[PDB]
Symmetry: D2
Subunit: 114 residues, 4 copies
């Protein structure tokens, strides 16, 4: 139900080997680790969760953008990029969290499909 | 030393009355409230802090984008837009945190000057 | 060698049925029609050209964003979105022209892979 | 009535000395030169035109991003960034054309005020 795709706006390439951590908000409002991985050679991260596990709730997807830019020898602004959203059952649904990275800027878009 | 500017990509206008909360990471690794405010009719938020108060640290600027869109009748994807960065680690700088908002997407850029 | 992918930042969806025109710059500096199509249900447009046809030169990819937003009943700013670039033989290469659309804003990124 | 503002997403700075050419579509459907200039140290370009001269029409604002990046030692993807729009079709407006530049990506937003 949840995929992450990351692009590099400096090199015009997939952003490879980006660490991605997903958290789910707990009843005590803390962030509990939910799933994680690293983006592939295609800048994508699949298989984070399953339909059974990915119930409604508030999720945070954190991309370690600082480590990514450091590895490329480029001084970045952000510590990380965080994407926070509520998962909503309103029919069958797939979430793609897309991110476009520059050293002092990023954009993120949600592509939500049936 | 810290200003926030927000635009609405649907209307082609400043994003007015966006609530902004700034936090600073404390010694115990928790997020301590640092300053807050709301964007003006120009989409800008000035006067959050001072050169004296704005010491080195890791800061989080949280824009309440969900409330912004809902007040305009739109159910957006994100809970908020969070911008996390180390500030002033090589001396005082002036930071403009810019954000561009769409219902299922946002971008953020930092302009940093000496 | 050339693919186009378009996303809709208002609906968080592929941008479907977007008209795409590709032009190649001629010797007299005019834009000559090269290929065209409409994005699919996945927001993608494949099969525009072939390795044999897609030689080095200056190309323009035009997305009819105005007609797209009009069909959705949304007032847009731009007449269209234009992406202009030189194709460069520097090893085996695939170009993806990606675009993210809002009514008063768009971004475009080139993903260039081997 | 027409201002251009450009930021550099690699440096987190204004994009200084970006050449800007404005064209207006003539009655014979060709692009007639309308105004030009370059961005200041603030990344802004003011004084392109006047309320009297800036009549209804279809305008193209072309930013020479390729020359900008090459002067900084970067071989970018795009030849330029072109922004094409109908202006003043329901009376005089003020237009800010904003652009955010990366070597293989750019975004542009319009802020339109009455
Ligand atoms: Mg429900
Ligand atoms: Mg120190
Ligand atoms: Mg060559
Ligand atoms: Mg009229």
């Amino acid at each position: 139900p949840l995929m992450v795709k990351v692009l590099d706006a400096v090199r015009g390439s997939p952003a490879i080997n980006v660490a991605v951590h997903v958290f789910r908000k707990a009843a005590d409002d803390t962030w509990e680790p939910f799933a994680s991985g690293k983006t592939s050679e295609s800048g994508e991260l699949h298989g984070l969760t399953t339909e059974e596990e990915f119930v409604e709730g508030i999720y945070k997807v954190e991309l370690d953008t600082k480590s990514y830019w450091k590895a490329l020898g480029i001084s970045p602004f952000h510590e990380h990029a965080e994407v926070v959203f509520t998962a909503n059952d309103s029919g069958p649904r797939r979430y793609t969290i897309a991110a476009l990275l520059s050293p002092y800027s990023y954009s993120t878009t949600a592509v939500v499909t049936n």
